[PDB]
Amino acid sequence: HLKPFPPEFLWGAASAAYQVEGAWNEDGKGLSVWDVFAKQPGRTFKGTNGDVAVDHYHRYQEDVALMAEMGLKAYRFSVSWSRVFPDGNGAVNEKGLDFYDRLIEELRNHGIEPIVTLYHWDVPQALMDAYGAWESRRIIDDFDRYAVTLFQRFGDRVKYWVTLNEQNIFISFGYRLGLHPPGVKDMKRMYEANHIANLANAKVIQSFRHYVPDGKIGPSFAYSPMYPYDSRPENVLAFENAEEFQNHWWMDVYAWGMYPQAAWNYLESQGLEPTVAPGDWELLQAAKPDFMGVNYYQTTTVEHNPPDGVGEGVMNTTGKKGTSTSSGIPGLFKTVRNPHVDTTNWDWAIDPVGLRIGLRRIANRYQLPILITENGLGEFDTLEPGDIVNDDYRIDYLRRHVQEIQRAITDGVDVLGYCAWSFTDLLSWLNGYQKRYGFVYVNRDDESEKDLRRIKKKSFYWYQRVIETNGAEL
Amino acid sequence: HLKPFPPEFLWGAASAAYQVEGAWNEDGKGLSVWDVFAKQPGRTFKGTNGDVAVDHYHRYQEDVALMAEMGLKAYRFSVSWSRVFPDGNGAVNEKGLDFYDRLIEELRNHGIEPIVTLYHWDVPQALMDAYGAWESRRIIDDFDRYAVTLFQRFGDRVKYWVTLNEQNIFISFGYRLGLHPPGVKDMKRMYEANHIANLANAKVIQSFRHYVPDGKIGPSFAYSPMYPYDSRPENVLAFENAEEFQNHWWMDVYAWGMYPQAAWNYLESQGLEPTVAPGDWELLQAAKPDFMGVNYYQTTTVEHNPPDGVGEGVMNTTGKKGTSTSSGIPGLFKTVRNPHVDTTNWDWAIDPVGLRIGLRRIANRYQLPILITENGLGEFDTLEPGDIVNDDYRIDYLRRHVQEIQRAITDGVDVLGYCAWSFTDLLSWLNGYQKRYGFVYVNRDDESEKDLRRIKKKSFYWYQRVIETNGAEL
Numbered sequence: 040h041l042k043p044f045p046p047e048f049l050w051g052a053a054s055a056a057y058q059v060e061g062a063w064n065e066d067g068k069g070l071s072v073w074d075v076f077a078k079q080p081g082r083t084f085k086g087t088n089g090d091v092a093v094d095h096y097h098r099y100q101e102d103v104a105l106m107a108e109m110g111l112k113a114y115r116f117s118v119s120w121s122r123v124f125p126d127g128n129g130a131v132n133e134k135g136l137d138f139y140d141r142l143i144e145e146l147r148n149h150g151i152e153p154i155v156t157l158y159h160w161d162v163p164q165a166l167m168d169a170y171g172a173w174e175s176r177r178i179i180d181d182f183d184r185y186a187v188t189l190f191q192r193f194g195d196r197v198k199y200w201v202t203l204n205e206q207n208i209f210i211s212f213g214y215r216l217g218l219h220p221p222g223v224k225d226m227k228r229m230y231e232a233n234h235i236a237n238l239a240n241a242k243v244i245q246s247f248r249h250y251v252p253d254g255k256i257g258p259s260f261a262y263s264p265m266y267p268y269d270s271r272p273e274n275v276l277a278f279e280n281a282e283e284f285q286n287h288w289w290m291d292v293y294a295w296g297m298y299p300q301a302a303w304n305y306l307e308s309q310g311l312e313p314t315v316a317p318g319d320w321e322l323l324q325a326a327k328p329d330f331m332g333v334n335y336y337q338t339t340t341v342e343h344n345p346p347d348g349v350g351e352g353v354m355n356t357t358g359k360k361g362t363s364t365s366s367g368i369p370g371l372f373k374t375v376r377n378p379h380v381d382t383t384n385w386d387w388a389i390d391p392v393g394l395r396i397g398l399r400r401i402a403n404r405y406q407l408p409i410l411i412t413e414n415g416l417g418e419f420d421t422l423e424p425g426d427i428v429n430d431d432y433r434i435d436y437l438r439r440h441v442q443e444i445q446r447a448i449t450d451g452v453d454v455l456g457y458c459a460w461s462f463t464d465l466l467s468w469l470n471g472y473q474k475r476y477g478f479v480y481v482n483r484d485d486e487s488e489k490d491l492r493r494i495k496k497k498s499f500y501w502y503q504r505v506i507e508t509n510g511a512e513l
Numbered sequence: 514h515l516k517p518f519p520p521e522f523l524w525g526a527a528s529a530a531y532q533v534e535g536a537w538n539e540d541g542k543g544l545s546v547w548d549v550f551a552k553q554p555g556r557t558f559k560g561t562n563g564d565v566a567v568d569h570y571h572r573y574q575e576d577v578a579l580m581a582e583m584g585l586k587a588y589r590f591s592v593s594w595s596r597v598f599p600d601g602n603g604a605v606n607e608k609g610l611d612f613y614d615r616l617i618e619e620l621r622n623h624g625i626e627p628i629v630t631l632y633h634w635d636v637p638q639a640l641m642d643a644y645g646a647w648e649s650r651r652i653i654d655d656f657d658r659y660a661v662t663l664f665q666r667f668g669d670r671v672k673y674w675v676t677l678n679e680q681n682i683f684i685s686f687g688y689r690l691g692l693h694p695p696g697v698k699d700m701k702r703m704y705e706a707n708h709i710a711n712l713a714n715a716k717v718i719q720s721f722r723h724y725v726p727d728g729k730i731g732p733s734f735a736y737s738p739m740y741p742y743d744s745r746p747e748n749v750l751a752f753e754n755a756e757e758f759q760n761h762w763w764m765d766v767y768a769w770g771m772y773p774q775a776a777w778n779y780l781e782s783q784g785l786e787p788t789v790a791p792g793d794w795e796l797l798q799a800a801k802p803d804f805m806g807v808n809y810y811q812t813t814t815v816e817h818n819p820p821d822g823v824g825e826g827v828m829n830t831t832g833k834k835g836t837s838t839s840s841g842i843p844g845l846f847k848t849v850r851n852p853h854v855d856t857t858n859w860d861w862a863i864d865p866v867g868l869r870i871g872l873r874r875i876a877n878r879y880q881l882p883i884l885i886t887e888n889g890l891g892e893f894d895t896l897e898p899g900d901i902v903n904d905d906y907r908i909d910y911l912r913r914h915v916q917e918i919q920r921a922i923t924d925g926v927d928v929l930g931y932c933a934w935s936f937t938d939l940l941s942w943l944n945g946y947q948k949r950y951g952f953v954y955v956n957r958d959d960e961s962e963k964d965l966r967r968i969k970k971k972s973f974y975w976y977q978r979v980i981e982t983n984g985a986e987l
């Protein structure tokens with residue numbers, strides 16, 4: 040007998056500003072690190088970039104009416120820092136704030152709760168130019184000025200806020216794998232920039248307590264719960280290293296203000312541990328979040344990895360199935376295909392029960408409420424004549440994840456809401472446009488913007504029914 | 514490259530009073546629940562009991578001389594509450610204390626650190642008679658007065674104290690399985706008593722802060738780290754339930770003063786959850802230990818268990834490799850044989866890597882120093898001509914476990930000490946004498962009491978070498 044979804048459960052959907060807005064040089068917006076990176080040749084699928092994206096900046100009113108028709112209870116979006124401070128830390132672009140004001144007003148006038156994400160990967164280029172952005176401590180105060188600017192302008196209308204969205208991705212993709220800006224492949228610099236982001240996070244949570252005393256705020260972590268391949272003790276041990284190094288490394292800082300010891304000692308043994316200043320631990324420990332945000336797509340299965348063993352593996356940005364290979368850290372763990380789950384064409388595992396597992400781990404380890412800030416399925420959609428999109432594959436994935444969330448709630452996990460990724464189809468950072476996630480199909484591809492028309496997919500009407508019945512009908 | 518064992522690593526060995534002392538009714542000793550229980554027919558193997566045991570009450574000077582010979586840095590033993598307070602809560606028996614005084618002196622005079630366990634399963638029968646012993650809150654102040662008496666008398670000479678030894682075992686064997694006193698099979702009662710034992714532990718830790726400010730104290734938990742069978746999500750979930758239900762249920766109370774929420778809820782749903790009074794949570798939260806005692810012998814592998822499936826299973830008393838059967842909780846998990854490790858003839862897993870995993874989990878979850886209070890291998894020893902016991906089997910098991918500890922310390926776990934189980938062969942609670950754990954063979958079997966002469970096994974000299982080389986030579 041399942042607990043019901045609670046009465047104020049934030050049934051939501053989400054986007055990120057670069058992926059959706061366009062208008063990259065309008066109304067005073069400065070360059071982000073992503074405006075600049077995606078235009079370097081070879082960085083992105085087919086040269087795709089966010090110049091136009093799906094033009095949500097101009098078309099937000101249409102998108103909001105669609106949200107209202109779906110009956111959305113919450114919409115999570117991010118603010119483009121480079122629209123508010125074109126040079127990152129100088130004078131404010133009022134026109135940039137005015138767009139988010141019009142957006143928020145449009146949401147409120149249809150009864151939709153705004154969830155504001157402060158940072159979704161788009162630090163202004165001028166901060167990268169002046170001091171290397173997340174690699175310098177200067178960013179702590181610059182990010183704080185920006186956050187407080189938002190808090191003051193919108194704090195009376197926005198109760199739910201997300202600080203850093205998937206810090207583990209933007210930091211590791213940016214500084215270890217070289218796949219995101221600034222395109223660095225240097226572990227030492229990765230862990231230093233990570234430490235600085237931890238500080239910036241805590242700093243803004245602290246300012247939030249002053250400026251938005253009734254709000255709720257948290258970071259959002261990209262969480263792939265680890266599993267051991269089997270009961271072989273070395274594989275279990277690899278599991279312990281993987282969960283600690285990939286997951287606790289961030290979440291313990293967010294929840295407890297502390298890095299876990301074994302991962303710290305491994306880094307220290309390699310000269311990789313971050314530089315710690317007087318006052319750092321005190322800041323990090325005094326900034327407890329109201330919730331842990333969680334972005335969940337899949338779990339990861341691991342096995343023993345000897346010290347001469349696997350390092351970086353092949354990622355899959357095409358969509359040919361079976362092309363991904365093992366990744367790891369030599370001597371600690373490496374990934375392996377989980378034989379007991381399907382995968383998408385991009386090799387992401389489909390593991391709804393894993394969401395239950397990850398939610399149960401976070402409650403068990405931190406006792407924190409959880410806002411699920413992203414979850415969804417990306418696939419090719421076919422637009423059929425008569426503006427029809429039958430995305431049963433997406434419904435099937437959403438249905439099963441939302442069911443497991445109900446199981447977690449029944450187990451006692453305090454889940455505040457669920458934001459499907461994404462509302463409209465949007466631009467993939469690297470993969471272009473054909474890997475779609477939306478409830479609302481957007482008519483464009485990697486080569487032409489077409490008319491950018493919005494077309495409700497079958498999943499739209501499915502989620503609309505989920506919301507109308509508060510989850511009883513899936 | 515391994516770190517070495519720290520310079521004052523407490524290389525130890527251990528026992529428990531009932532298992533070793535005898536003298537069950539000498540010098541004013543009152544009856545314990547085990548004195549009564551073991552005499553009930555068919556409870557113990559061939560009616561074996563501890564009237565005499567291995568007669569350590571009278572032979573302690575020989576036993577301590579052999580310890581000094583081995584070079585032991587520490588010796589962990591329990592105090593028999595019924596020697597000290599024959600009625601549990603009336604007047605103190607000075608001759609009871611006097612024995613422990615003499616034993617401590619004997620240990621100091623040979624430079625051996627004594628480790629005093631307050632409770633190893635032998636509560637005075639009068640307290641079971643007067644008010645149900647662990648089922649009543651009265652035991653809390655009674656246990657406290659007993660512990661404070663010890664603190665006052667031996668505080669100046671004993672730095673390391675263990676409070677409750679293997680609470681999960683005496684509670685569970687005593688109130689769920691009915692295998693130990695008080696011979697009950699009733700979960701409501703188990704959890705009530707469990708709760709009272711939690712409070713007792715916290716009360717005496719508090720008292721200890723007042724009475725022995727420079728001492729170190731903690732409970733010691735019987736820890737079988739759980740593993741999932743494989744990476745099937747339902748199997749990993751079953752691992753989450755098992756580790757939380759079997760392990761965190763106790764350790765999070767010792768570390769953080771609170772029960773895990775999901776297990777609590779599941780209890781609450783069955784009507785099994787304990788009764789809580791004003792002040793319980795404040796007391797439990799306020800009783801932080803200096804370390805976690807860990808008694809380790811094996812890990813457990815678990816798998817999905819449906820609502821109709823396994824509950825209580827068959828244990829293995831006989832020694833016939835193969836006779837154990839899955840045990841579980843319907844709906845949550847059940848055990849299953851781990852194909853990747855070996856077992857003893859009693860179906861106990863041999864899994865030294867499990868100990869490193871276990872020590873890594875406690876450090877990762879709680880950040881506590883650990884004192885391994887028991888680890889050991891139980892088997893038949895043959896005494897061969899020339900006073901030779903060739904216990905290679907035993908050396909092999911202990912060596913591998915000590916190696917894995919060194920690895921844990923190298924990972925960053927703070928391990929204060931290791932106490933092999935046991936110094937001399939002793940009496941098993943249920944299984945008699947033939948299943949031996951000692952470094953020192955004691956000349957008796959289940960029939961013939963013979964002379965109880967101490968004979969040094971091969972392992973004795975193995976461990977002698979280990980201590981001499983602070984663990985470099987194994």
Ligand SMILES: O=P(O)(O)OC[C@H]1O[C@@H](O)[C@H](O)[C@@H](O)[C@@H]1O
Pocket residue numbers: 055058205208334413417466467468469470474
């Ligand atoms: O499957 P993709 O196209 O590589 O994208 C993954 C998505 O999921 C998360 O990784 C990001 O927060 C999103 O911004 C992104 O859209």
Ligand SMILES: O=P(O)(O)OC[C@H]1O[C@@H](O)[C@H](O)[C@@H](O)[C@@H]1O
Pocket residue numbers: 529532679682735808859887891940941942943944948950
């Ligand atoms: O039943 P066995 O094989 O003798 O093992 C029991 C041992 O197991 C441990 O659980 C106890 O703390 C010891 O007191 C005891 O010696």
